[PDB]
Amino acid sequence: GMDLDDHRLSNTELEQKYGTNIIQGLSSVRATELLARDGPNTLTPPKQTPEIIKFLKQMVGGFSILLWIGAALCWIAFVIQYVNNSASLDNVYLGAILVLVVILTGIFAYYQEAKSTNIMASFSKMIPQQALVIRDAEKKVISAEQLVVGDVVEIKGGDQIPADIRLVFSQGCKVDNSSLTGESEPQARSTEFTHENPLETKNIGFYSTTCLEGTATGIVINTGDRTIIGRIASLASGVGSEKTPIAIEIEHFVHIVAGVAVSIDIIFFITAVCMKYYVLDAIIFLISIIVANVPEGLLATVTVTLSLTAKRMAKKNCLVKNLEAVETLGSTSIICSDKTGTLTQNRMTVAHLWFDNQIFVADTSENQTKQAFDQSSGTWASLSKIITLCNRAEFRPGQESVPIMKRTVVGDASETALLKFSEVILGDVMGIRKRNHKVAEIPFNSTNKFQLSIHETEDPNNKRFLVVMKGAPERILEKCSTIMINGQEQPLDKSSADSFHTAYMELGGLGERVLGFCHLYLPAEQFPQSYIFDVDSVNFPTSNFCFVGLLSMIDPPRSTVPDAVSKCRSAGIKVIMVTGDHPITAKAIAKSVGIISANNETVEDIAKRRNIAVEQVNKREAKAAVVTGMELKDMTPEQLDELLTNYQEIVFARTSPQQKLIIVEGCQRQDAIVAVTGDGVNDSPALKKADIGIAMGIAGSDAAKNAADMVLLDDNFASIVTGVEEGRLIFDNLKKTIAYTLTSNIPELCPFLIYIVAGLPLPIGTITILFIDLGTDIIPSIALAYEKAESDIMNRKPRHKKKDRLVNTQLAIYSYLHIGLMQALGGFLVYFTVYAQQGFWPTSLINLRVAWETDDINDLEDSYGQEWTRYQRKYLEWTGSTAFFVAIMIQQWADLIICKTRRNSIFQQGLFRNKVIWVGIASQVIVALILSYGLGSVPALSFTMLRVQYWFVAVPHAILIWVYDEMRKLFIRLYPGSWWDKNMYY
Amino acid sequence: TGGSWFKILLFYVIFYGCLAGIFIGTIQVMLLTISELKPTYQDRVAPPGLTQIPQIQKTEISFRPNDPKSYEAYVLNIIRFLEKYKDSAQKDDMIFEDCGSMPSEPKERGEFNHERGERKVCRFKLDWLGNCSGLNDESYGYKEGKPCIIIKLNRVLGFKPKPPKNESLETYPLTMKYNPNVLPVQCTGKRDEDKDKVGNIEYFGMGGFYGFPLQYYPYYGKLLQPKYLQPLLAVQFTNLTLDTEIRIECKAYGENIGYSEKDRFQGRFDVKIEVKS
């Protein structure tokens, strides 16, 4: 961890510190011992957990601990029975089923558990392989890994910088620090101290950054992981090993259910000890409690629900790498978005052009077909000609039928923008450039800030030389003595100069780079056709020009971004722009997108409006704030918290990746779920620390797409509002699914409680309730995830993570007590009907379980005096168990119907709008019919055939459940916030 | 708040009370459809089971004639069962009717309705169980190697056993069929090697016949016909190998009497007797 940056030092101080020489370098022995001590110049990959331990750790998470305890108890019960010569089995079956359930749930949880992976593989595309380093004054090619701090390295154009160097000799070196700032604008390099911050010091080259053109010489200062990109990779790989909000909700639900199961098991085990029961009976009761109170199929059902949503989102070109990330977008409260590449198109494009003392507005959409800004007006022909002819950029080959804005261009960004504009608005400038012959003069020297090209008109009428020139507007104006306004030329009026200057100031205020244009026709009287031209600019005049127009470029936002941001802000989400660009451009883009509204106004703007000191204005009036990198590097964390809390609209500018991480962490300190969108290397630490990270697909980089939880393949920023829609719908339907899963636990638990307490014959077995848990409820649990939105999902506020939970006390109370008890009552009605219709009246079944389950007795006397053999008793027991199973199934049909809604009514939502619900009901019909009249024709797994009337006894209880739930929802609807909403709504 | 607590507790009290009321009402409506005189269904008890009296636990009998405690359990159980079959408890004539000593047709005592009052039961006297009655023989045969077990047919309401017609060949000629009035019962060794050690079999039934007389059927239901004494058949062996375990099977033959592989007591026995020296 080294941060003692010393770019202020002169060459000699660097020499003394690093013990080298420009002419000499480092000796071979010196370099070898450096390679021994400091370490290779290579990004060290991180330690990763092998997948098999990641898979094995899934077998102890969720409800699996309880299932393992149950399997151990099953084995203990079997060994006790085997000691006492009991070949009944029925317990190896249960143990095998429990182990299989554990294995399957672990498989599903492993499938849902993240993706792991590392970011280092993405950096290989940028890291150079070799480097031209000098040792003992000899220029040799050495692999970049072998390069070590202290040696002199020479960098040419078009190759990656071998390591972090301090430039000492430079000659026209321009680097591309897009990995540190996110901007592809070439940054010039020098050999002098420019800025205190090492990221803008202009005399330091950075590891893996590319040198666009020129030669440079520098002394290596940092290597390997101590470089800036090294720290970026270390941060992007060493953070993010944290749970997701949906994982926390599921863990809380598991904690509630496991606590309920443990408490009931402990208390009833103590009671069984206090009631003269054998240990075998007690442990069998404990196994039944454990199996009944655990929703085995729910944790896999949640995974399947997330998978279905992920597939139907990936159908919309939205790849979801982490399955848990489908939910997070929707509980998100803050979206920290990168500017360039994400909000904007990352392409320089003309936006405003000024002529006739008016400001014209140009379309900037990516898929635009034509431009129309009062083209029929005067002076436009001269502007068109000067834009077309005065350009050097050229299109790349193999572009016959390529979209115009998607055509690759070789040249400067500004030249590319003007060339794209001319191609769009004129169609074919290649013919126009060909027909107008170009004199071999185009001075584009540095420190000039202008360039001119002499042409001869192809029109037979005029046939005069033309000198078109564009460059910095001030230089254009100082060389201009007249302006062309609607054909004819006005003199250099004071009012015209004032209009020029105010247009300049306002166009700069919109954060755009203006370029001035001017041309001067050369009459043939003074310049003949055969007159020679010289590059020295002495053979032709460069004064007394005429100003035609003034164009500016913006790097505009994408077409769908402003509407998406407006919808996100209308959905209760707070959007923050965190960018590495200059504050002026960031503020302009924020105003142009919607992050800062037109009415909202910042502190600096208030100070400008009132002309008062910036310290005099009260910050309470300002509703927006723009914070630069320097204002944030010296900001105490409490100040950052207050800045985020106070201002609704914030823009961060000139921020390093570490500062982006700081902002994300500070936003998460407010108990807010944050989402980060980005498409660059500098966004990787933020894309990892964020709860959900979204990356662009076409414009994105490999590091960002590896560090993100979701990738937008078509770069449609509008997919965020659909993601929020899907996340909120997922949360609601997950509440519904959890309620429907938990409601069937009580009908499975009550029979064993009654069997222990009142000594009835076993109303239902453990394998039978496992059949309920695994077979019948799974498809309806999937079906409840297809419920449409009850109300305006995208009009609510984001849920509070701490206050609002997926499984609150209301849902658990309603699922266990209000419902579930009714289902147990209906099932017991069916059970008593089955037993009484064959001879055993309800009151004769009290405390009969000891004599009922005695294989010795074969003359048990029922209510009518008949004598029952042991096998007939257990066959009647199986009949009652199957009937109780069927009663549970039918009341679960009713409960599926009532769980289709939470506040609405089945009359409003619709019974048949969700066909997967009816598929689930049909599946239960088929499964129960099979389990009754197939398996059961041969008596196996405590299933027997049922009489026709035993299939319909519990139907009135299902109707009662439906009527009660309809009344509850009706009273919730009628009187909101009336002790009924607060207590009965879940 | 305290008022909120009171309101929620009142709601839960009324809600659970209403649920209990609905449950009890459904139970009452269901019970209104079952008769107190005959069961609605007899799906499981239609083929009657066969059961012995000593009520042995693991389907085994292991005792020693020497030590009284070795057979004390069996003797006490037989005494407990046969106490109610003593003629001293059957003397009253208002509730008992002396039915003839010769097997006859089943007696139809009216119909399963509250009218006609209670029913009268044919009396079964212990004298018919020769030398296993306990009148003038102690230990109920559990002297040196003379075990005997009382076989009974499980009670079923409205059950009229149909003895097999002697058209088809049932077994070796018993020299007395009397099919229309006696349900045949025969005890044989389970497999071949136990037939050589089981010894002779002595059957003691009413009228000297080897089976259950049909005059005692049908049963009427412990309400119309309480104090009903089912017919008994004492089976004594009198000859069996000492210090050897013999598996003996007793089967009740009839057209209506059924058997089952799943149910081992549906008209069959699996009893083992071992007489230690």
Ligand SMILES: CCCCCCCC/C=C/CCCCCCCC(=O)OC[C@H](COP(=O)(O)OCC[N+](C)(C)C)OC(=O)CCCCCCC/C=C/CCCCCCCC
């Ligand atoms: C949420 C989960 C709920 C689960 C509920 C399980 C409940 C288990 C209880 C079952 C017993 C139900 C009895 C209901 C009978 C009907 C009500 C009644 O009016 O019946 C009066 C009884 C006679 O009815 P019968 O059967 O002869 O009718 C035969 C039908 N016919 C009349 C046509 C011949 O009068 C008599 O003879 C007997 C009089 C004496 C009765 C003493 C009972 C003492 C038993 C105490 C055990 C309580 C355990 C509680 C555990 C709770 C744990 C949460």
Ligand SMILES: CCCCCCCC/C=C\CCCCCCCC(=O)OC[C@H](COP(=O)(O)OCC[N+](C)(C)C)OC(=O)CCCCCCC/C=C/CCCCCCCC
């Ligand atoms: C014989 C045995 C039969 C067993 C049958 C099933 C028994 C279990 C059934 C239900 C128990 C559900 C337990 C839920 C536990 C939640 C754990 C948890 O994570 O807690 C967090 C909550 C947070 O609260 P909040 O801010 O969301 O609340 C806001 C309320 N607002 C809006 C009014 C301000 O803390 C809280 O709510 C405080 C929670 C207080 C809970 C007190 C105990 C309630 C349990 C009662 C069951 C008693 C036995 C019933 C047996 C019936 C037999 C007929």
Ligand SMILES: CCCCCCCC/C=C\CCCCCCCC(=O)O[C@H](COC(=O)CCCCCCC/C=C/CCCCCCCC)COP(=O)(O)OCC[N+](C)(C)C
């Ligand atoms: C027969 C088929 C099954 C039937 C199931 C029946 C379910 C519904 C039962 C009771 C709910 C009745 C009240 C609905 C509206 C409440 C308004 C309210 O609670 O007002 C509140 C005060 O009320 C109370 O203190 C009493 C609370 C209600 C007590 C109900 C009776 C006690 C419990 C009964 C449950 C019985 C359930 C039995 C089911 C058995 C198994 C099926 C406060 O109102 P506020 O000043 O905020 O007004 C708001 C002003 N605004 C509207 C303009 C915004």
Ligand SMILES: CC(C)CCC[C@@H](C)[C@H]1CC[C@H]2[C@@H]3CC=C4C[C@@H](O)CC[C@]4(C)[C@H]3CC[C@]12C
């Ligand atoms: C009479 C008997 C059945 C009542 C039993 C009530 C039990 C099962 C309920 C009531 C209160 C509940 C607890 C309330 C608080 C917490 C803390 C939470 O972090 C985990 C769940 C846990 C631990 C709950 C477990 C289940 C719980 C203990």
Ligand SMILES: CC(C)CCC[C@@H](C)[C@H]1CC[C@H]2[C@@H]3CC=C4C[C@@H](O)CC[C@]4(C)[C@H]3CC[C@]12C
């Ligand atoms: C709202 C009501 C209709 C829901 C109740 C569904 C009931 C009535 C349906 C669902 C499953 C069906 C049963 C499935 C299996 C069998 C066995 C077959 O050999 C006879 C028909 C029978 C017995 C069906 C009868 C009708 C049935 C019981």
Ligand SMILES: CC(C)CCC[C@@H](C)[C@H]1CC[C@H]2[C@@H]3CC=C4C[C@@H](O)CC[C@]4(C)[C@H]3CC[C@]12C
């Ligand atoms: C009938 C008896 C034996 C058991 C039932 C006890 C019930 C009625 C009592 C005991 C504890 C009570 C709960 C205590 C805590 C809460 C959480 C609160 O946010 C809503 C009320 C609620 C859910 C209460 C509802 C009523 C309650 C569940």
Ligand SMILES: *[C@@H]1O[C@H](CO)[C@@H](O)[C@H](O)[C@H]1NC(C)=O
């Ligand atoms: C048992 O009773 C029979 C009845 O005939 C009798 O013949 C036999 O001798 C008795 N057995 C003994 C030895 O008690």
Ligand code: ALF
């Ligand atoms: F272009 Al950036 F963060 F400003 F990726």
Ligand SMILES: [K+]
């Ligand atoms: K369960």
Ligand SMILES: [K+]
């Ligand atoms: K993440």
Ligand SMILES: [K+]
């Ligand atoms: K369940």
Ligand SMILES: [Mg+2]
């Ligand atoms: Mg970017």
